[PDB]
């Protein structure tokens, strides 16, 4: 066995109850900090 299809995907219900870590990712650094509004 040991090589299986998925019967269901991993839900975000499980990651929502966890405690956060607060680790600093390079793509979550501040950029494009001002929004543009249409006329």
């Amino acid at each position: 066995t040991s090589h299986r299809p998925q019967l269901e995907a991993r839900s975000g219900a499980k990651a929502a109850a966890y405690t956060p870590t607060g680790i600093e990712h390079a793509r979550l650094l501040p950029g494009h900090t001002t929004l543009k509004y249409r006329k």
């Binding site: 299809p5 998925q6 019967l7 995907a9 990651a15 966890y18 956060p20 870590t21 607060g22 680790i23 600093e24």
Partner: protein, 145 residues
């Protein structure tokens, strides 16, 4: 960098590691999305009383159809329901449009010399020889007809 290292010491690493898609696993994530779309469309055509067992067996006709496509063997299952056969042929042609177009795109990269992986050169060779014979076998049938 060191702030990520020291907080990973004091707190451990997070359990919510979501892996982004990559060149390494794009063929793996394509089939997971392709199997879910086939499993959705058949489960909605079903009248009633379909479980995790019957959804498990029908996805093996999806795999068998794509091996028959690559072999240029006609996939015809005796007793297959005509709505459900229509669904699989819709998604085998959908996967074939990605498989053939990736063979055209990567061929143009190998000619330019523009950073093709050593595995992909063996993979693009193996794709075109199926496309050449599929074009060869089709040309044989147009003379015979």
């Amino acid at each position: 960098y060191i702030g990520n290292l020291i907080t990973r010491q004091f707190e451990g690493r997070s359990n919510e590691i979501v892996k982004t898609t990559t060149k390494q696993r794009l063929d793996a994530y394509y089939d997971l999305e392709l199997r879910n779309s086939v499993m959705d469309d058949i489960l909605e055509m079903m009248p009633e009383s379909i479980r995790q067992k019957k959804a498990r067996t029908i996805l093996q006709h999806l795999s068998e159809a794509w091996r028959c496509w690559k072999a240029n063997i006609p996939w015809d299952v005796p007793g297959m329901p005509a709505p459900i056969k229509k669904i699989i042929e819709r998604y085998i042609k959908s996967k074939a449009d990605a498989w053939v177009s990736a063979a055209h795109y990567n061929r143009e990269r190998i000619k330019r010399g523009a950073h093709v992986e050593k595995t992909m050169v063996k993979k693009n060779l193996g794709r075109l020889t199926r496309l050449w014979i599929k074009n060869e076998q089709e040309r044989q049938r147009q003379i015979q007809k």
